[PDB]
Amino acid sequence: EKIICRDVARGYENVPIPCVNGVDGEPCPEDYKYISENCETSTMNIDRNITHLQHCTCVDDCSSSNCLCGQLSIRCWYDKDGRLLQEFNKIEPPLIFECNQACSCWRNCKNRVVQSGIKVRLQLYRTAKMGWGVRALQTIPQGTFICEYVGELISDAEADVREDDSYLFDLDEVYCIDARYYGNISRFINHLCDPNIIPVRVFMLHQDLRFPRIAFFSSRDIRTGEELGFDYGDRFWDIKSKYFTCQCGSEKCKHSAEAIALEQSRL
């Protein structure tokens, strides 16, 4: 129904991300600061030393198996259009090392998908049962980069005392991204027990292994209007099931009140 914000990102992304609500009277969410790149609220000292970057010497478009950057993930997993290869492991994804400012290659090489940002048309919208959600406004072929899980970098110890634990994404002494107070569009992606996107750890401008960046890609072809969603995983549900249960409504649902009640009947 009503278009209620023309761009939740206020021009920080490559494209605008509109918000609509045809469900209820809830106004556009503004209890957070939209940021397009991860922010710091304490001394983290991300290793940005340019001489610590592994880097390639390619004089082509980094489409060859000889690209050193590709070899850091066994191979480059991007096809010629920037999409994950069919055979990419969607269950235990590898760490992806994109090309960087120390590489000899050009900015448009084939190993630079995540750093080039959002390309698909997305919408923030009001769901029936799970609050605000994110959907596609175009068809999205399998393997397409969607967006990054962007927010506030914090320690494990800080993440353990955060009052709101709805937006914490573990990086792996582990660090976390908290999208509660600062985040981007990914903060609004819901959990689906039948997921259509997956998170992948990615290095780009630095290779500080404490701080992988979290990239979502489509795990299948997605139709226009489909809700996007991933599997939050058991580090989420084991704690959160105490407070609410899954509303995804899939027949495969593993986290509904029913599924948990049926599993407690384990006798």
């Binding site: 005392v161 634990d165 976390c176 998170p199 580090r235 704690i239």
Partner: peptide, 9 residues
């Protein structure tokens, strides 16, 4: 385990 809920890869 941990005190707070955490999404993960």
């Amino acid at each position: 385990t941990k005190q707070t809920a955490r999404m993960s890869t």
